[PDB]
Amino acid sequence: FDMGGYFIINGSEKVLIAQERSAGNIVQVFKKAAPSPISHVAEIRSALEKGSRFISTLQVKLYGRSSARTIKATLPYIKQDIPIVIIFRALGIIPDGEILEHICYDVNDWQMLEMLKPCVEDGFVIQDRETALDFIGRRGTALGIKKEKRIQYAKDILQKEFLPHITQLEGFESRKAFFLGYMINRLLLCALDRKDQDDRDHFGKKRLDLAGPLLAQLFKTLFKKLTKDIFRYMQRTVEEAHD
């Protein structure tokens, strides 16, 4: 009768217990409280199964309750939040109507477009992609042959780390742009009160971690430790021999 999925450690029957967490890689909005300068935020967690834990947290923030009407987007490793028109130029969208086509979809409605006009006015500063890519986000490490920032370095950020699902390779900037525009549309719908506030205690937005994934975490960590140790003793066997 002992149908049992458990382990025997030191001769005592041990069992795992399923953990849970919020679902990764899924859009949530929020309504942070009034005294904070932020009113609505959007979040994206991400993962990629699961090299160096792949946290890669992203926000899109809104300000004011008027004139503070602005959409600053945070991003690692950029130490300041950025207005989003800079990011659209950085991905390589110049003309503003097509930034708007990325953001909103029904050209007939307008309330979102008057809602976005101040961010466009913020975007009046910079009219070229690398002249947007230049912007600072120092956060280490030491700069190489640069003038202010490598455009190559910034585009390497946007390629490798940023939004580590839909792609990671080299050439999918338009996909990144549409994804960003969809995110903005969701946030803007929440703050424009056509769509209600998200919920966190809906069950489907949770996943149950279990024995396989838990063993995957321990195994990845232990094997990366192992790889570091085997990379040691191979460079420093300068003297004989190849053991």
Nearest to 88 by CA among 64, 122, 44: 122
CA angle (72 as vertex; 66, 73 as ends), nearest 5: 150
Residue type, 61: K
Our finding on whether 208 is near another protein (CB under 8 A) is yes
| Helix (H) / strand (E) containing 227 | helix 211-231
Our finding on whether 48 is near another protein (CB under 8 A) is no
Q: How far is the CB of 228 from another protein (least distance, A)?
A: 10
| Candidate list 10, 235, 239, 240; residue touching another protein; CB under 8 A | 235
Q: Return the residue matching tokens 């455009």.
A: 151
| Candidate list 55, 79, 160, 196; residue touching another protein; CB under 8 A | 196
| Candidate list 31, 56, 178, 198; residue touching another protein; CB under 8 A | 178
Q: Candidates 31-39, 55-63, 69-77, 126-134: pick the segment binding another protein (CB under 8 A).
A: 126-134
Q: Which of residues 79-118 bind another protein (CB under 8 A)?
A: 92, 94-98, 101, 105-107, 110-111, 113-114, 117
Q: Return the residue matching tokens 């719908």.
A: 189
Q: What's the token pair of residue 79?
A: 């130490």
Q: Return the residue matching tokens 């803007």.
A: 188
Residue type, 52: S
Q: What's the token pair of residue 82?
A: 């950025």
Our finding on whether 55 is near another protein (CB under 8 A) is no
Our finding on whether 171 is near another protein (CB under 8 A) is yes
Residue type, 217: Q
Q: Which of residues 1-30 bind another protein (CB under 8 A)?
A: 1-2, 5, 18, 24-27
Question: 38 or 50: whose CB is closer to another protein?
Answer: 50
Q: What's the token pair of residue 49?
A: 């199964």
Q: Candidates 33-41, 73-81, 137-145, 164-172: pick the segment binding another protein (CB under 8 A).
A: 164-172
Our finding on whether 70 is near another protein (CB under 8 A) is no
| Candidate list 41, 72, 89, 122; residue touching another protein; CB under 8 A | 122
* Rounded-to-integer distance, Cα 182 and Cα 29, Å: 13
DSSP assigned state of 191: H
